[PDB]
Amino acid sequence: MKIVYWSGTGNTEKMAELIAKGIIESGKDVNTINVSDVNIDELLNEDILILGCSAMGDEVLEESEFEPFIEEISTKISGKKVALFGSYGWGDGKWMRDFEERMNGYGCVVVETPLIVQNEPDEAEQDCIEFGKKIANI
Ligand SMILES: Cc1cc2nc3c(=O)[nH]c(=O)nc-3n(C[C@H](O)[C@H](O)[C@H](O)COP(=O)(O)O)c2cc1C
């Protein structure tokens, strides 16, 4: 499987690692890719797209790299399964409610409830591993 993410300080990156750990513990392989090093062509062959990005700007996806990437793949992902995650700070998840609505609008099937964790995953570490286990079980 593949996990593509954007992280500004490392919080979403850590969530990605823990989610990968859960998939691996389930007996499956998985690669975590920073959005800047992603190959759209190969990514589109995946059964499930695992995407993560922290809450940026005023409750939006990161604008210079992650957002353009979502727009790029938007026309080629209808019917695909997606799992969404990300770290946030002061809000209550508005950027993720919007991200989920958006992916749904592109024709994707959001397999699990988006996983959002405030700041760094410390107390939420197991939740991250469990999210990975749920995904590897689909
Ligand atoms: C420029 C900027 C804008 C932000 N906007 C939001 C926001 O609208 N809502 C929110 O809850 N957190 C917001 N945050 C906080 C980050 O989502 C939060 O610090 C998160 O843990 C960062 O994860 P990262 O290291 O993966 O990027 C913002 C952070 C920055 C730097």
Curated annotation (Swiss-Prot):
Species assigned in the record: Clostridium beijerinckii (Clostridium MP)
Alphabetical list of InterPro entries matching this protein: Flav_short, Flavodoxin/NO_synth, Flavodoxin_CS, Flavoprotein-like_sf
Assigned protein family: Belongs to the flavodoxin family.
Keywords: Electron transport, Flavoprotein, FMN, Transport
Entry GO MF terms: electron transfer activity; FMN binding; oxidoreductase activity, acting on NAD(P)H
Record carries keyword Protein transport: no
Cofactor(s) needed for function: FMN
Domain Flavodoxin-like, first and last residues per copy: 1-136
Purpose: Low-potential electron donor to a number of redox enzymes.
Cysteine disulfide partners in this protein: none
Protein's UniProt name: Flavodoxin
